[PDB]
Symmetry: C3
Subunit: 333 residues, 3 copies
């Protein structure tokens, strides 16, 4: 039955970007092949040169967003090159059975594997490494991402009408727990293994030292701000594989929001701030109505402005003074 | 267009009370004018006399609840008197553009401004100070409030039938991070600026020293308890501009709840406890059925009873044995 | 009126199991009678032998799951044997009035009391001891459980069509705050009251030392894992009386989820993870499609794998390769 299905090989794009795809499926079910190479590497996460041993899928934190349609088959080639030092695997929250695939994809350095599963449920899902015994260590090292399973007929609003986005961005929020010495200075290590014992102690406090988007403080600001123009409908996928988050677009709203990311449910309207539970991926749809700079933040202001969970959106267009304006006071009637 | 619109000035009331308004709009769009004066002042937040330098909108924590109807224009005159020492602004989650107004409202002591914005979406929203560089500090110091944008035809239940409340209260929950010395004794400072450096160090621990309703421990208890009578429909707007909370009425429920506070969505029924994400405002509707004392709390009981997030409701009326009765009063076995 | 209603005495069963009951009420409203004895006891909560003074309802943590139908009357006989040292009571989130019944059931050692209330709202609610002054201490010591008020016509899906479960399980998550000494060694006490002072201090940190399912780390693993078979519809009731949790079944999904547990509300579909607020009970409905081991965890992987909030499911049946299969098993590149 599956041999009569077309097979397509897709090349993944580094976040916050997403590979090309059709919102409304033009073909019947397919076997979408993806390839991801695991890379363990040192990553500088802040302005102060704090460095950590990131464990990544395709070299980025978060891993790339994969997009397929309901009932397509996802066939993933997971490679763990010999340059790495730890055993890894992959668990998709979209898959059914075998711990999300984690039980079937344990690969040591120098090993690879190919897993296939049917995307039977529409929605955006989290995928993350989960090695027996060191689950929270791999996840909080950035080894997580998301996969979007679009309904075959695209997104629909509260009333069943079509919702079409012109842009789509993937924002991966990551909570880090970097160990410090007695004074509070961040430690550096030679290999991931060396940091392990300290890492565990740091995680157990349940208090992140950093909370970033796209792997670093300010990763999504300045020359890297997300862009759009007045009139465009933007879909923002947001995942957090381990800790609760509450996204908010300062100066805008979430017109249609699937806080828990499951498309068979009607979206929530006009959200100012929405909660995305840890271990979940969510999606917000919004049409920009004013130009200018917008801050996309985790609305626990301390986490956004002190720990790092804040990004920018730079929107071009004409100002609408009917929506907002600085009043001039020369009158009484 | 605006020039030909009726204007109505409204005098704000200090929480938990709310200024006079109509649930169902008896007129067309209007320009509702409000005036708020910024006041930086010392505030005692607990029984032990702990004192902090509060930054308030109109002299209270939280600021007053502003109430308008969908499509009205809010016109706010913000005044920062010369007695204050810091620059402040305001960001409305209900507004579209210019960082919710923050980018258009920066005022130093001795300055004032008048912002106008269209209330395009119905629901309860948070509004807070957000000066570039010291956002968390201004919010955690109590500079936040909420605005309700009622649908022009009032509230509706799950089935589209009208919901009318007889009383409405506004509870703003506030998380405080008071700095401590080596022994654990709370610090005191002469001015807000003196406290800054320590304030940031305290915030970064992500652990509040106090979590209070209406500005202080027991602000809504004893002679300050919210009141009602068996049979009355009450609407409780609750806001938290920086941290998750989970309101609960011990002895009652949330008959119709808008946890994320956006009125175009149907409420959730018969909630025992609901989550209001930080940076959001929610609303619960309840009709009292039994007289007596009720405790309105944040259901992380440690936070409610140890940290201060607890309030009272003293309700009058006749007891109803059908709903509850002590068949056998406590007695020795 | 009540004097006429048929009465039914229920025999409680220890969690994670549930006592006999009908999903669909076969008779009209009745007075369902229950009896629970309070027991303070020492409990080993982890592999390392950490001991604590648990305060329980019926000798278990959590207390047993009580099931009744909408509009039945619940009559609970609560006994506090003279072997206990503290005063206790019970508050049902499902009841209306007297602080959920807490104000009418205060019993000292050597006392008992009988309370009757009407189950007017359908859903799974939390019940917990709540003595004036030591509320969080009693709750965080395991003195809590849940009660399910099913609709007289059983459960329904998003479209109103009947949902019938084959198995039902009750998972009570408990957050513990065990006091430690300088080195980090957990403390032991002779009696509950001796522990009180240290307890309060530990609680105020807001950081648990243990987060477990059913009373202990691994209580629902190995020979105690929950069981099911491919094709079976399972309903999992989950509660947390004081802190937020985010349930996730690794390798599965929540087909129908009532995150805040109130049945008059349609369920959310295809949830990967859902947030249940502290002081709330929720319910997830799933049908197993793959055999094998599934982990039921709190998706804050630190709280799950390091703190103890992880259970198992052992499912029997035939593997379905369409849903998922290993195309290439791990091997050297
Ligand atoms: Cu890994
Ligand atoms: Cu997971
Ligand atoms: Cu300010
Ligand atoms: Cu804000
Ligand atoms: Cu007790
Ligand atoms: Cu309670």
């Amino acid at each position: 039955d599956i041999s009569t299905l077309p097979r397509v090989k897709v090349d993944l794009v580094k976040p916050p970007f997403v590979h090309a795809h059709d919102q409304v499926a033009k073909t019947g079910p397919r076997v979408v092949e993806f390839t991801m190479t695991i890379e363990e590497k040192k990553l500088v996460i802040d302005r102060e040169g704090t460095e950590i041993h990131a464990m990544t899928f395709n070299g980025s934190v978060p891993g790339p967003l994969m997009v397929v349609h309901e009932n397509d088959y996802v066939e993933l080639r997971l490679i763990n090159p010999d340059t790495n030092t730890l055993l890894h695997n992959i668990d998709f929250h979209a898959a059914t059975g075998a711990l999300g695939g984690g039980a079937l994809t344990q690969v040591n350095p120098g090993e690879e594997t190919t897993l296939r599963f049917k995307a039977t449920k529409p929605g955006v899902f989290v995928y993350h490494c989960a090695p027996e015994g060191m689950v929270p260590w791999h996840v909080t090292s950035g080894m997580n991402g998301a996969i979007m399973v679009l309904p075959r007929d695209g997104l629909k609003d509260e009333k069943g009408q079509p919702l079409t986005y012109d842009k789509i961005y993937y924002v991966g929020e990551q909570d880090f727990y970097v160990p410090k010495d007695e004074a509070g200075n961040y430690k550096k290590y030679e290999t991931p293994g060396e940091a392990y014992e300290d890492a565990v102690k740091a995680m157990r406090t349940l208090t992140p030292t950093h909370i970033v988007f796209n792997g670093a403080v300010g990763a999504l600001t300045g020359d890297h701000a997300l862009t759009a123009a007045v009139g465009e409908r933007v879909l923002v996928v947001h995942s957090q594989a381990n800790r609760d988050t509450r996204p908010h677009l300062i100066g805008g709203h979430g017109d249609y929001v699937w806080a828990t990311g499951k498309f068979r449910n009607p979206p929530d309207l006009d959200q100012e701030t929405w909660l995305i539970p840890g271990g979940t991926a969510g999606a917000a749809f919004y049409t920009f109505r004013q130009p200018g700079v917008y801050a996309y933040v985790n609305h626990n202001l301390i986490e956004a402005f002190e720990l790092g969970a804040a990004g920018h959106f730079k929107v071009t267009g004409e100002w609408n003074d009917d929506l907002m304006t600085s009043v001039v006071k020369p009158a009484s009637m």
